[PDB]
Amino acid sequence: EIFIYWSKSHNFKREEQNFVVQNEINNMSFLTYSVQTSLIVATLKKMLPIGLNMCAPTDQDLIMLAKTRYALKDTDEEVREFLQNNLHLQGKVEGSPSLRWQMALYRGLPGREED
Amino acid sequence: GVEIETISPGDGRTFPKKGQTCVVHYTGMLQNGKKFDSSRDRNKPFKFRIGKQEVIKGFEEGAAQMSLGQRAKLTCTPDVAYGATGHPGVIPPNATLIFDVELLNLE
Amino acid sequence: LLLQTNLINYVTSIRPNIFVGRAEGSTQYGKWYFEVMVDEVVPFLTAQATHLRVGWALTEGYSPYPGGGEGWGGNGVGDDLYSYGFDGLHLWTGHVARPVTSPGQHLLAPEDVVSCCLDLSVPSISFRINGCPVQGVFEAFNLDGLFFPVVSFSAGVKVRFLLGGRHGEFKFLPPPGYAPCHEAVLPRERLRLEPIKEYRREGPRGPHLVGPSRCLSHTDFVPCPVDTVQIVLPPHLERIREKLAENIHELWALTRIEQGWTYGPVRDDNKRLHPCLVNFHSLPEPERNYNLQMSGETLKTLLALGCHVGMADEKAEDNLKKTKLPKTYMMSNGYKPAPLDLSHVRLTPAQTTLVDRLAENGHNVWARDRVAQGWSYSAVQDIPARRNPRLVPYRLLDEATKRSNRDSLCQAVRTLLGYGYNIEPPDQEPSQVENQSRWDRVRIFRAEKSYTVQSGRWYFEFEAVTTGEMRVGWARPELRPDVELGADELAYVFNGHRGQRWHLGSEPFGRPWQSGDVVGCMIDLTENTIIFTLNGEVLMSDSGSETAFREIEIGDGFLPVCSLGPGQVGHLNLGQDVSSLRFFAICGLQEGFEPFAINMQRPVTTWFSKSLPQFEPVPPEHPHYEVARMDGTVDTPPCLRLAHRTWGSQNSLVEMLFLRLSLPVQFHQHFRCTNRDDPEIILNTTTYYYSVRVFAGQEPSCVWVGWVTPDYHQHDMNFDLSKVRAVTVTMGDEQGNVHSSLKCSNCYMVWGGDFVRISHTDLVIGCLVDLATGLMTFTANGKESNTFFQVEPNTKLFPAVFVLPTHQNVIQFELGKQKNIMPLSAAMFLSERKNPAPQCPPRLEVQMLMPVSWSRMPNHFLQVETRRAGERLGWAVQCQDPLTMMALHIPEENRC
């Protein structure tokens, strides 16, 4: 959510730029203005695998779809609903045998049955 | 003629005779080392009766000298073998044959 | 002409880890006697008769890679001139089946106690099956390397590998003067069966992909120490050696104090009774003499090794004196304590750098004394037999006794250093281990070329069990098996022992791995990047970067590869079952990467790099060598010249180019025993001819012109006519009146140096062959040489020359005839057996010797069991499951 807020507010980005440049923070030893060296991106870059792990395979379609919807920039509520109705849409990935092994793995997790 | 190289000793009491059916699992080869026929690959033993010239004379004599349950190695020179013509497509002319035979049963 | 196929059983051999040999003043006994008791053997478990041979072999060369070698495969014990086998009816060697007579002969059956032997005094290998002597002995065989006992079996066997003493108790008895085979193992290791040159070991989680294994060499049993003549008495050495000896003699006295026995004044040395603390001078004049000599000669070894004993800031008082304690009082024979306290000073690791090899040049020199006296190494104390359990160099000596030697030198140097002397070890400079092992240090396991990925994020794992020179990564399909990984452009790999990404060189990267370190290899082709995860964490470069390499052009494709070095094992988990992959979920799954063998339900076939040199055609674009066809005019015959392009420049590479023409000549299956060309002679002759014109600037002492049998697999960079396989299968009709001595070999040539800047001109060497009588003769510029070889029927022979270039014009094959001797084109082809005109069709090509070539790993290896069957029954091999390939035999090369 922090990242998402950041990508919208231009003044937020310019302030990040001014801060990193004027106080002479290395942004290099921090890695050990460049947006990548900014910790704003790095937090999510490292934290992304967890979030993706929170979603089972059958959902990535909706993700792109919701990603598609964010091209229109549907409200949080709007994308939420446009994925709520498409409950039939995600699933039946047995028709996609390429997803079977991913499915089996995310089942074999300490995460329990399909709760 | 033929020769008897006792690769493994059989019984030595009983021998094939006239009017008896001998069964063999023969794997065979040219003198250089190439292999032409093997019963073992076919998976069925080969049958013949000492006397009516089923096979080349040499093979018959060689299997006649043998005992029961005795592997051996016949070496049929061309004259007691197919001979000058040779089996067309399999045996070249005037070739000497070597036969890893094994007299299994005598009935 | 047509390629030929057959179904052949796997054959696999197991040796014990005994190794013996002989060399100049070597520390190894000669006679060796071991038995093999068959317990049960099915004769015909498959189409092929069950394979079982017994014999010895040679260390360097016996590499029976599972699969297909020479002939129809099944290279057990005795299918090469490095091995010497036996079968109950034959004496196998060099892939020949010469028979043999033993009383009541019969192929290897249950309860056959094959009593093999080996006396390398001559060289000889005799057998005694089931008690009756085998009337056939190998002789004259080569003696470089080490000989180990080895049986060879197909499926469905069982043999017990008796070894004397408690490892099998010799049903029969070793002939007089012979030795058990268990007293040949070194103390540094134990006894265990093992296979030979394995590239795969089934492991707990799966295969292991072991790399090359380092064996001993016949020298390493002989010691090579420094001497005791070339050093003198320097001044301060003359000043200090007396004090050194005075202290160390009594320290050695006190080392064994009350340990074995309590001192009795009956004896003053040699039986654990030697305190002599006050007085070591009155001790035996030889004894005290070589005590002063221990101190001196020790310093003298320091000099030869190269220290510079030089005093520093003087130490005259640091509270130093022989400490008086009630324990070990012993007024008798000296009350003055040996150890003067030395707490105020210590010993830096540099003096240890000296002390270890000081213990060497002590122990090894004593061993060089004993072996000169007559003793030899053993594993059982044999006093009157003059054999001991420690007659080895320092390397192979037991750990504890090495530490005891180091303790003696520790007390000596501890007495010594405290005088400000600047003892220091000059460093010792490494170099190349040898010239032939340039390629014999890496095996490059890759998947098949048919799995080339060209898209999609792929991933796998490679658990580096050991930390050695082993690297893993993606590689391009045309991977050269001769150059190491990453030196070329065809490899993007990651070395672990240093920690180094590798491509067209090495760059710093990541951290070195320890054991059990999964190194997850990824590839993101859409972004054209490669990433490496050492234990989950992404290996970050020595910079802000994350991927190891960027902008990897898709090109032809990529496929996994792993190089494993000496002693280096691993595990290539391409992950057919993803759960077996250990780190895929932690990194590689939440990013779009799929495992490599994600749906290849059948396991991914892998190909490695053999180290069996086979002849290969001259690359039409070779960096250096250039073969030129030259059609023959009315005078010169057709000729395949060889030229060196790069001579006299940078990368003017020089090395022996083992050349060989493609098609062989085959002798007659039966031997004949019992100006212009005359028509009848040239129509009924059998002598054939070819010749090699070694040019000016190519020293004739650097060419070897002749023939090679189709089993020449010797890429020797120090070649000479003494490094060629040989054997003499002497068969006797009885103990006397031996009646046949066949001489066998794998290479028949003459060295041009015999026939030759006393002069500078072109030289020509001809090679005649009489196919009917088997005789072979060589001509030298017109004369007749002295050499002549006589080869048995059906023998195949390739024309071949071995040249070390010394000019941009090395040699020239000259396919021509003489008066009444047909050329080679008559033999090599059948439709020209009556054509007296020399010919050179395109199939007759020049082929060099490439030391390494790719080959397949069978998807199903044999499963053999090894186990101590009991104290009295010895070790017990056993194989039961049948397993067959379908070989492909190329008739001309006698290769499958």
From Swiss-Prot, chain A:
Detected in skeletal muscle (at protein level). Fast- or slow-twitch skeletal muscle. It comes from the Eukaryota. Coiled coil: none annotated. The N-terminus is blocked. It is found in: Sarcoplasmic reticulum membrane. Cytosolic calcium-activated calcium channel that mediates the release of Ca(2+) from the sarcoplasmic reticulum into the cytosol and thereby plays a key role in triggering muscle contraction following depolarization of T-tubules. Repeated very high-level exercise increases the open probability of the channel and leads to Ca(2+) leaking into the cytoplasm. Can also mediate the release of Ca(2+) from intracellular stores in neurons, and may thereby promote prolonged Ca(2+) signaling in the brain. Required for normal embryonic development of muscle fibers and skeletal muscle. Belongs to the ryanodine receptor (TC 1.A.3.1) family. RYR1 subfamily. The calcium release channel activity resides in the C-terminal region while the remaining part of the protein constitutes the 'foot' structure spanning the junctional gap between the sarcoplasmic reticulum (SR) and the T-tubule. Pore opening is mediated via the cytoplasmic calcium-binding domains that mediate a small rotation of the channel-forming transmembrane regions that then leads to channel opening. Homotetramer. Can also form heterotetramers with RYR2. Identified in a complex composed of RYR1, PDE4D, PKA, FKBP1A and protein phosphatase 1 (PP1). Repeated very high-level exercise decreases interaction with PDE4D and protein phosphatase 1 (PP1). Interacts with CALM; CALM with bound calcium inhibits the RYR1 channel activity. Interacts with S100A1. Interacts with FKBP1A; this stabilizes the closed conformation of the channel. Interacts with CACNA1S; interaction with CACNA1S is important for activation of the RYR1 channel. Interacts with CACNB1. Binding of [3H]ryanodine indicates that the heterozygous channel is activated by Ca(2+) concentrations 4-fold lower than normal. Single-cell analysis of cotransfected cells shows a significantly increased resting cytoplasmic Ca(2+) level and a significantly reduced luminal Ca(2+) level. This is Ryanodine receptor 1. It comes from Oryctolagus cuniculus. The lineage of its organism: Eukaryota, Metazoa, Chordata, Craniata, Vertebrata. The chain holds residues 3440 to 3585 of 5037 of the full protein.
From Swiss-Prot, chain B:
Residues 19-107 form the PPIase FKBP-type domain. It comes from Homo sapiens. Its main location: cytoplasm. Identified in a complex composed of RYR2, FKBP1B, PKA catalytic subunit, PRKAR2A, AKAP6, and the protein phosphatases PP2A and PP1. Interacts directly with RYR2. Its EC number is 5.2.1.8. It holds the Pfam family FKBP_C. Signal peptide: none annotated. PANTHER family: PEPTIDYL-PROLYL CIS-TRANS ISOMERASE, PEPTIDYL-PROLYL CIS-TRANS ISOMERASE FKBP1B. Has the potential to contribute to the immunosuppressive and toxic effects of FK506 and rapamycin. PPIases accelerate the folding of proteins. It catalyzes the cis-trans isomerization of proline imidic peptide bonds in oligopeptides. The gene is FKBP1B. Keywords: Cytoplasm, Isomerase, Rotamase, Sarcoplasmic reticulum. This is Peptidyl-prolyl cis-trans isomerase FKBP1B. Inhibited by both FK506 and rapamycin. It is found in: Cytoplasm; Sarcoplasmic reticulum. InterPro entries: FKBP-type_PPIase (IPR050689), PPIase_dom_sf (IPR046357), PPIase_FKBP_dom (IPR001179).
